[PDB]
């Protein structure tokens, strides 16, 4: 169906009406989303079918039609933009300075923006428009708000 690069909504008809379960990035013929959005299931793009190619539950990432293509990284200094695609709402660029998730295996950038769960898979981008990660896997802090990691895969 549509293989043009960009941001896409991930919809399902299995629940009430047409529900947006997530978001993804089409780059170089490959669709990139978070694992929890599709659970590894096949996707439809008009009349064409997209089959999973790579996936990892711990990274919470999945790629379709080919290997993971997104390899830019947050520079640990500069502001970034979450290209938020909320359910039923227009794509909107939100500029922010990322915080940090400190883990036993190293530090990871994090964006403190609260959006509906169906916004999972929305890309986080740098000043060059390159996707440095996806939004949607993180934690709930003291006041109940969501803080998401900047989740990036590996380009082989």
């Amino acid at each position: 169906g549509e293989t043009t690069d960009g941001v896409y909504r991930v919809m399902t008809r299995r629940l009430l009406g047409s529900t947006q379960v997530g978001v993804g990035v089409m780059q170089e013929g490959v669709f990139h989303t978070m694992w929890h959005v599709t659970k590894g299931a096949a996707l439809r793009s008009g009349e064409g079918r997209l089959d999973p190619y790579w996936g990892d539950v711990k990274q919470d990432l999945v790629s379709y039609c080919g290997p993971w293509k997104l390899d830019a990284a947050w520079d640990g200094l500069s502001e970034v933009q979450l290209l938020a695609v909320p359910p039923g709402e227009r794509a909107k660029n939100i500029q922010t300075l990322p915080g940090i998730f400190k883990t036993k295996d190293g530090d990871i950038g994090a964006v403190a923006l609260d959006y509906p769960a169906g916004t999972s898979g929305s890309p986080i981008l740098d000043k060059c428009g390159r996707v440095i990660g996806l939004y949607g896997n993180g934690v709930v802090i003291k006041n109940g708000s969501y803080v998401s990691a900047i989740t990036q895969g590996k380009r082989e």
């Binding site: 909504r9 669709f31 694992w35 439809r44 539950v57 990274q59 915080g99 883990t103």
Partner: protein, 39 residues
């Protein structure tokens, strides 16, 4: 059956809404891909 629909271009937009703070949190990542807070 899940289906996709285009929502826009991936480009940096000048003069976009600037919001959100930058917290430094101690977190743990489990085998099921779930992040939890460590305090």
């Amino acid at each position: 059956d899940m289906y996709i629909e285009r929502a826009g271009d991936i480009t940096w937009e000048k003069d976009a809404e600037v919001t959100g703070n930058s917290p430094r949190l101690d977190v743990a990542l489990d085998e099921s891909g779930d992040f939890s807070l460590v305090e």
